[PDB]
Amino acid sequence: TNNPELKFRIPPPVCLRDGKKTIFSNIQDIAEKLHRSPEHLIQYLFAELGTSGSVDGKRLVIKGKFQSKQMENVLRRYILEYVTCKTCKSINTELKRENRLFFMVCKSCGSTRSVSS
Amino acid sequence: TSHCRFYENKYPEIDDIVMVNVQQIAEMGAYVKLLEYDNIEGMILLSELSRRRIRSIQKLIRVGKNDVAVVLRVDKEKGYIDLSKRRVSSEDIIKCEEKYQKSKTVHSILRYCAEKFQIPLEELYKTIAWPLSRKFGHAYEAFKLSIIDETVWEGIEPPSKDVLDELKNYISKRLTPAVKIRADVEVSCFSYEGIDAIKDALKSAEDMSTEQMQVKVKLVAAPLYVLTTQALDKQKGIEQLESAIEKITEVITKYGGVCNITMPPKA
Amino acid sequence: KRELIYKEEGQEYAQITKMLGNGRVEASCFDGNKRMAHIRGKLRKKVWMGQGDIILVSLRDFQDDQCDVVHKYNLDEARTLKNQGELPENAKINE
Amino acid sequence: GETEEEKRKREFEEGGGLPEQPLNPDFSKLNPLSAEIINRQATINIGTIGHVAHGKSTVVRAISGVQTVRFKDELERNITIKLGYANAKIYKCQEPTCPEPDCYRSFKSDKEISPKCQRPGCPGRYKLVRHVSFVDCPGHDILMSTMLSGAAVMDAALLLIAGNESCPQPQTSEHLAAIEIMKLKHVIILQNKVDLMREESALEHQKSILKFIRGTIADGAPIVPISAQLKYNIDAVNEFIVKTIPVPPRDFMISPRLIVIRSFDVNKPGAEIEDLKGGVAGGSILNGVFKLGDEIEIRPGIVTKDDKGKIQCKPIFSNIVSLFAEQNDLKFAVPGGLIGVGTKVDPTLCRADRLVGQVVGAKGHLPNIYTDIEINYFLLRRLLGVKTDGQKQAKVRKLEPNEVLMVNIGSTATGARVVAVKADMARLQLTSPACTEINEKIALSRRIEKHWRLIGWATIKKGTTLEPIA
RNA sequence: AGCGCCGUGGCGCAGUGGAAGCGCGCAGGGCUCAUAACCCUGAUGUCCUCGGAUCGAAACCGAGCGGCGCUACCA
């Protein structure tokens, strides 16, 4: 009764390679289709990838030569440990804070997990 | 007017260390002004300029800014200085820059006093600054003592006692810090009465807090008690905190417990 | 400005996923497969293929596992083809 | 336009509030369900057991609402060493009109005597059936001592089994066996994951659960489908707690005793020392009723080694400054409920792991510390907590002389050496002192696969005593 | 919770007291048959926030925010 509906909604990753430059123009669409703020996604991108980039307008520009293979792999790993809840197969969970550590919490069930490192 | 030497004479001495500002590099190197001594020019030609191979000419010279320097030869007829920058060891450069920092700091205060009283800065350096540097090795340490002890000025002949008064004022306003002495006491009691023992211990400890030096035993953890005080002479806090140690040991050697010292008093 | 070339009955568009050694490449064909392609003649050491650039590759009737590159699109005929829609438009590749 | 807090305060004053305990009530007439006892203390100890990383603090927090903290940087996520606690008041509606399954309602300890019925269309008020304490026990393979200590403290049990994962999890079996050892035959079974399971998968899991519990001492344990995160089917669990667990026989006739399991030091950082508090022994009192202003001594106390290496025990005398239970400061403390005894004991004596598993006696009794304890022991046939990849379960080997075994006498955590092994009897010499009062239920474990593994049971029948130095 | 710190130009460091700093980045041209290494030159910052002393604060300090390492979950 409560959940008659009971993700296959990951955007097709468009890696836009301008020679020595890389553009991820769809980053806003992924960030909104996984219910994660783009700031944290970009931080995780610059944590797994050891570079720096600029945000324009929604779009991320990083002057470097990189494949869509590794972008897809890092997106899948982020979804595995951030977007997807480990105890239950759900996407409703979001990033929040409980003293100073980052404590992402669930909304579909309400669990208490942490993924920060 | 900003001028005058920082050290005794006007000419730099042989085999000493200075720190100079660069303004201009023509062909053979940079003949530059000195900020440790006076304001005359002294040259570094390209052979004694870069320890590494001579690749970057302007990057390592950075016209307009300061850098460590070492004087080789002095021409005591006209004011010509031969000087280098390669020949200062990694150990040396830090003491070089420390001496420059001290000399620069002592300059501005007497600059203020000279501007206010319209006295030449040379006169102020001759009267008060140089005898202080003779007495104490350096004048900034003399002013630090002047904050603590008024006697360091006794033996100097001011151009006017008004200079002394306004210099007291500006040194107290400008040079003011009173280093914090902290320590750590380990309470290792397995005894019966320990809370009341700690209450009496801090009562005794804080009863010794003077007007100018106040001791408080803050709680950060149960076994580890952190002792904090501000010593202005940096020579009373150790004894007061050893007094606190004596108090705590006397209190707890009779309640039944054991207490030990982890970190003694220190700046 | 040389004219582009369209596909014919067994020759299909693809994208170099990453180029292989010793004169081979791996081409993600725009059919759903990560096929292996050989850099043909007429094209070996005159028109250099860069990783991440839309190309034309000939299938072989008797091997569907491996195919051979034929023509290369210098990202201009490629963008025009994407505009016309000769390839599945989810995999957009552009500078 | 009244604030939520104003509404809660009005409901609290209308709900009966939190009474203050009489300073001197007639004791022989005090039953564990009396208002002076029930509205402010937890009289029945209820524990949770299960395999690691399934959610037991989750279930308890869903039930009562008092969090188990889960502290210590690394231990916020992986495992905890200390037990978790939570006070739950079980309320049932007086109205027969509202159906029985949702009549019950468990609330926090701060709740009033009679909060209103939150079921829509039900104006009747709730009645406090009983107040219960919750002893959360970390279910890990590495951590054995605290599980057995709490199980000694426990009075009834709740076992947690996950749905989608493997059916015969060995840690659940080990905890159920340990519960069977220490005379606990009241367990209720909960299926934690049912929402992610199908109608036939849940039935297969239930059939596997029944198949598992056939040769165990507990036979008719009720089985409950529950949701830890979804926060549903708690009133029924309250009903089962009320029905299948009656009050263990406990009166005031027995001599006073205490068993410290955790140790708390009240030292709030930043505050001046002129305003402090005493040291707190978190203890289970299975016998004896303690009041304000009672002198009490920790028998094993100060453990020291002389210059010859001999073991000396200085009992830790102490004046009771306060007895904090549930939520409010209370005069008398009901035996059979976790209570913080805040005495004037040195705060450093209670730092983290100092008073864990230590028996304590009120003035008027002299328990004995033993150096030698001769035990009547018994074993099982196969180890629990070991996953063999398709072969026979690890078979318990008989004891060998001069061997270190983890012997948990009730709560006391001691590592004993064996002097001799007999048909039914054994002799153990202990390095960390243990005291004996009547018999104390004991658990045995050995070191084979790296960490401790439970082996069987034992009871002390005799031993060599050390007269404490006063 | 308190302590020991920190607050950046894209990232890293730095002096803190005279007030936009250098390398790594990137753009541009320079050497090169040509690429890389190396030359040189740029367009970008609340050195976190509120204050108080100061001729002057980004700097000395306080009253607050955020990120941290411990102490330790400290009824």
Ligand SMILES: Nc1nc2c(ncn2[C@@H]2O[C@H](COP(=O)(O)OP(=O)(O)CP(=O)(O)O)[C@@H](O)[C@H]2O)c(=O)[nH]1
């Ligand atoms: N899908 C789902 N997840 C649950 C359920 N119950 C608990 N969880 C989640 O499982 C994880 C484990 O929770 P936790 O309470 O910390 O386990 P623990 O008992 O403390 C670990 P140990 O057994 O060693 O003591 C949590 O993320 C919790 O939200 C449940 O019923 N369903």
Ligand SMILES: [Mg+2]
């Ligand atoms: Mg727990």
